[model samples]
Target chain A: PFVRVPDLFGSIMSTKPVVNPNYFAAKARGDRWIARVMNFNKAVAARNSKVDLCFLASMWAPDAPEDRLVMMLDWNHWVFLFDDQFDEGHLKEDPAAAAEEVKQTIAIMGGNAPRYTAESNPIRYVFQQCWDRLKAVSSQEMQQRWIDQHKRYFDQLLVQVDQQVGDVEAYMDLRRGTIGVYPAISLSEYGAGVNVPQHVYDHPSLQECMKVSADLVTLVNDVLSYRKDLELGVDHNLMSLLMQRDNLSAQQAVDVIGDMVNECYRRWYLALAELPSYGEKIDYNVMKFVEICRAVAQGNLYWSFQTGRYLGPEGHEVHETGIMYL
Target chain B: FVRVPDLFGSIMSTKPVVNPNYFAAKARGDRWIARVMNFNKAVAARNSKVDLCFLASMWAPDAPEDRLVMMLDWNHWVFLFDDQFDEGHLKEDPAAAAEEVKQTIAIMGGNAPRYTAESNPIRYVFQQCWDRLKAVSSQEMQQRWIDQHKRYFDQLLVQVDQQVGDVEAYMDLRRGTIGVYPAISLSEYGAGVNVPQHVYDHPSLQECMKVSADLVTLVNDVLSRKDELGVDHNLMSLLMQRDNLSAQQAVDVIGDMVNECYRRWYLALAELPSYGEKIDYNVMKFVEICRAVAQGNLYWSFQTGRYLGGHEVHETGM
Candidate 1:
């Protein structure tokens, strides 16, 4: 009757959310894209329809083209299904099959292989469409960053599936890569057309800033999903690890993780000043890209309250009290 | 199927395209070199085998002869200090090492050495540079020199503790201990180039500076003969020992990393955004000076007497 995960969203952040006006139009098309591919599963529809990932697309890419938002939602829809397939499906214990699945996906997106049909392999088929649409509006560097981050995410997923990490720092390193912020960063850049150079993004402050934001986003989701994942036989989470390593109780672990959230908020603001300036024109582009990066966290933070994946029917009650009955 | 990456050849493929001022600086520095030779021999120091002035020629090819000669002394002191304290009593017992480093650091402030001038050849060469550098470098540049000097020595003690970790950790340590930034410090000394603080600290410029440091460290680690210290401590040694790579295979792997790093370095340079015409022009000048030092380090590795005689092909050097 007593599980409390501090109001982490409120504890570290307070801001009104923003979304693209075209989201209503984009939502219908995005669902159609899912259905065409769903002729490709029941569980997938239930997960997709309820999460409102189209809203996440709208929030992160508020000024993006309606078609672009639809594809963003579609790609995200695949990520959720793909991750679910591993987490609750056969791929959890099947490293070889998982690797092959990732390889074919990489090949299709990389344009190294011919496109797959929805009938032949719906997963690869959806990714191919997503990658083609992304490429049509993307620069070479944008595509390269996307592919690199995409490959890295699956590689770390493979690491997590086959092994249990003991060291907290190393686990955090692996989690940062797997948590999808890196790819989302590339997509958000495209959405807002942030024209800052690759090296600028690669700079110490901005790179470090992105990681802190990634860690913040990751830990927040882990806290929300802790109980759900436990019943699903998953425990690769911050609270789980802290309890294992430090002999802390669930509530004690949340205290430590909550403190980390406050620290990251301080770090993110401090690192912003250290960012190098381009000309005045490009700095505005960079700030827009940064706004979307921050939105990745905000979008997920609120989405949890609405999505049954975590909060469920008592979502508002959980939001109001920061407590969920164990 | 892997070939050794041509460390020096890569620079030659680009520029070491030597500066036209090379002959002039070399001509001027040879006069000071004559006295340092007698002083080095008097101390029974083991470090005077190469024409250290030649090292400066490659590193500061574009530097005016006046600034070029000061760079010569900077090189002279750096090589001798490493050779002298690299082993024996002080290396094993760091209590005295800290004392020795502090004493040397004092010479930056226009102070006397703990040793008499002839007693330690490195101190003599070092004292000469600070006095020479005084007239040439601006206050901020001098402060950079002072700051980076402390960083190198501080990391040197860290190295002495042998707290080496994985490759990235090792490189982070090497970035300080290699003393590359201070060496780049004088590249524009006496030249009238005022870079905006923001421009120099920009990620691409910093990466360029970092790659310059990394390239030199990697080259020295792979190609030098300093490894009698045991399955010795070069990055190449760690690769062979840990990664189970053979001599050439580890070398090949290092080659791959270096190639990718160099490509990244070049791309970073290309991507450096314009900070208006005046600052951009000055920024490129300072960058050229940095390239000369890094490129020169590669060339000097083979040319110096350090590795030229009876060196083993499999030798790992620091």
Candidate 2:
């Protein structure tokens, strides 16, 4: 039954459904356990490596996988989300056939009636709604599939960089080094060779980090899930082919991953400051150290501790590492 | 110790010390919640007539209110995912403390720490975040005291709007017609209007409408919350607040909001056809009813409705 919760209470409940509704609340909490599992998986997976951070990606729940795949690939490069990608005219332009094809397409893509529902993706609908606006804005030639593809790819690339940072961080622990790898091109190096992980935690700190990371991810998942659950009508898995599904241009998915990156920095800084000796690194050479760290940043953004420089295809300007190696 | 199943399982028992061990995770999550809650509160207070969309925002245990508030605001207006607004300095310059402070001041107001482990009006911290951003972008003068004062007033206005909508909805049910009183300005326009308690899911559609109308305010909050969670932190909000936070002189916050508004509208339209006829209306004009039904749309947007004769805003033909 529909009910009007007091504004404050309702506001609190809707966004943080985990706080009030018992079901959601438990879901909010289950994250702690999930985090424990992921962290463990990452740590174990990257054990004995030279990397500093591991960017762990998880998509445990598999729901309507095929439909998700079709949606992601078909609309992978559009600026708008999937629901918007299929706006009436784009499907067939002929109303009867278009509507029929839309149903059939959704069905063939596994968006069969038994699984998909429209309410699941309000924003996805928002995407389609805007496409109508786009069609209104430009001529038929302007709505070229290529332009749409570029937009989709640009958005996906953004999400891809964020996801990679997780792999780098998890790799760090597996590598057994406290150095952080930063992404060179992404975030202008915010994650560019960021080797500030303070991996000397006991049960309490790990529990705390796990709890917080879970909360952060859950918020992310909530946004992604809302998009998936309501907007795109698919599963939430950035690592899986699912993300490539229906070409959803969801900033939420990217942001969620970005959120993880932000937390990675925050945690490293916090950990560094918490230690007495570590925080006292020479300020004059900090920039050099950061650059060194970036050069050391590997794969997507791993830092090379030995050379004191970031490891990247772009190579270093100061030329600290050997040119041939770079 | 870097072994597989055993290592992953063993680390579970090896947690770190709290001071900052995993602060990154805590801060990130906390930041997300701060934005979410602040946005939800603003939206809730703003939307008294419609069904409240965003309901709650909460911080994780270890995170403080200030950190989240500061970063969240940055994320909403300017910060884009994977893009560093602070990158201009490169790793060469110390993160321009002036700029960082400027960014800090946008959310914190006077800078003494309004809502930290040190200071508390925890909720006000969220308000200051908005006020600071509003002051830099919209306010002509930059008076700290006045900015702080206005921030409080804005919060109060939202609260009053929320409470009034809630009360009026209750009162309408005791009477008869739901839409007897059309919402005017921020407050209800037709006061003496009567309406019997509703049996159809909505006991007071007007109340729900009022709530939905107000929900639009929460959009900013949502954007803000998404920031707090570290979802994205572009320089748009900051740049708008100061005519330009950086020399980058980008398009600024309103544009992003407008862009989002467009995206949201598209999403709504894409999904509306699927909504049951009880709520569906083919023409874009039906969005007006949607605004009425939701009651959380921006007031000015609704006011814009009067001029639109059976067309969506874009369709208004200049």
Candidate 3:
């Protein structure tokens, strides 16, 4: 049975995004920052999308200071720019070039770059800025955490260039980091002002929670933006992969992923309860970070509805009709 | 018809003049080997052909007496299992092979309520070994060891099902099937510290362990190449088939792989991060033990007639 598109995740993604009252100011600042730092005017002309008000609002919390909101907003902007360059740029068309780019990017991220001063690559420049800011704000341990996670993300992205149609299990492994969920959650420390101790992060249950949250966010985004992916002939989306691998109808794939999303939510809360205490101050911040992960998951859901990247005539048609064939 | 490649020129094998603990370990290993072989009357029936003590020098001579004995016993048991299953009945009967896997899994998981002394020799020996393993390790470490052992057995079955002809493909499977994980799992017991699961599962650490495992397989392949000429499943055979290389060429290629694997192992070891004061020390010791196993096996393979087939003995005076 074909069901309403947004209603597919309705029960699972029931958590509402907490709004930022200073969203307009943050959004304006984000727009100007994107234009200055990343050339939003050129990006909009190239990619047919801009980091809009809804994305900024949904991404960060109302309780967070405006500066922190700007940080996250910049992160989202930086991430989208990176995604677009790899997805639609020359890298997408050439595997050899993509591999070289990944190697260079890894060198820079690993702090062994010899000639990164070569200009005209906005991608490298902007990522260096983001990483520098991350290092400045977070502790050394947190910076190392972000670097390791980001390296995993970058390393896996290199494999995507091979354009192999792997099984659902293989795709799941790639998407966990390649979809940018790990680094996005790593930034939640800055948003929540919490540095989760190494031991806490190493806890098996907490690691599972982090994994489930990332999967939930990635799956929801996949289901919502799959139409754009289809238009672009990007068959890497989970829906397409699952539909092909399992020989399921489009509707069946959606329901299966939707059920997975619900299960992740259940496990997320279950693990939250089992989180060991680490005193009041750290515990308070840790709770805030947990809330931020939920918010990010919720934020992605709301942003996909409002972002023009997914919400133009074609998307709005599906949005209004509450039915999607693909 | 046989020639050792010059690629073996670069491999520097070392062993102590004598493993002071070998006599003690040999006594225990002899008794256990006899006990297990005694159960297999068909194998015992050919006692004249069986060199049950061929692997007595397999353990590192430098290890403490008690640790050396345990390691020697462990290695003896593993070699017997490999020979009995991989080289014997299981080679021809995969159904029985799979059933044996199920039986071992039951013993490991402690679900065999009816398991007794009269069970198969493999299970009986495994039960005794696992009991000793459990006594020395923490619950968390035991769980990880069991998980690794399961993976090792699973890969063995998977290797049987695979029809691999490519050198790289064969190596990828051989690394897991060669019993490196459980052997590395014992490193914790030898080090007297449970590597916290986080450190144990780290990608950098796992990469080092994998390189060490690969070195073990490659070194063994190089040493045993003459004996394994028609053996289609080993690294040397796959290299010959896939690369269309001569026997000497295949030995050289496998020897290069062994050298490269060791280089990467040391590089990975250098990159490993210290988790904390206690864990960092234990992790280093564990890594050292892993390297020792690889080097120890290289020394042992030369000492034993298992690989040389008694053509020439390069005595390390141990």
Q: What's the TM-score of each model vs. the native?
A: 0.49, 0.20, 0.45
Highest DockQ: give the candidate number. Answer: 2
lDDT of 1 by residue, B242-303 (tens): 88887788888887877876687778988899988878888888777667767777656654
Taking the tens digit of each residue's C-alpha lDDT, what string does model 3 give over A1-326?
34455453454366444566445445545665556655546435223223353354335465657777677777777677776656677666667777777677666654776543215666676666666677777888888888777777776676776664227677778788777777777766666566878777777667776677678767877777766677788776888887997798777887888777777877887887878888997777677767666666666665665443464323434555877655
Error of 2 at B158 (Å): 11
Encode model 3's per-residue lDDT on B1-318: one tens digit a residue: 435442222323433223444433444454455566564634432331232232323323355657656665666567667765567767656677687778787776578544444656656767766777788778898898788888788877775565221566667777888887788776556546577888888877898778767877876776663653665556666778888998778777766776787677767778788778877887877776666656555554553334663223342210
Docking class of 1: incorrect
Candidate 2's C-alpha runs over 4 A off are A1-55, A58-326, B1-117, B121-135, B140-167, B170-318
- lDDT (10s digit) by residue, model 2, range B1-318: 111011111111222112121222222333343344454533422222121111111111122333333433322322221012223322222233234334344553455434442343333444544554343332332232233333323333333334334323322231121111221111110111112123112323333333333333332322221343453223334444546343223333333433443455445445433334433322222333334322322222222222221112222311
Candidate 1 overall Cα lDDT vs. reference? 0.70
lDDT of each: 0.70, 0.28, 0.63
Candidate 1's C-alpha runs over 4 A off are: A40-47, A164-166, A230-233, B1-318
Task: Write candidate 1's Cα lDDT for A182-243 as tens digits.
Answer: 77777766666665677777777777767876887788887888778777877668878998
What's the residue-level lDDT of A209 in candidate 1?
68
Q: Is candidate 2 or candidate 3 better by TM-score?
A: 3
Supply the global lDDT for candidate 2. Answer: 0.28
Interface RMSD of 1: 36.5
Query: Model 3: number of clashes?
Result: 0
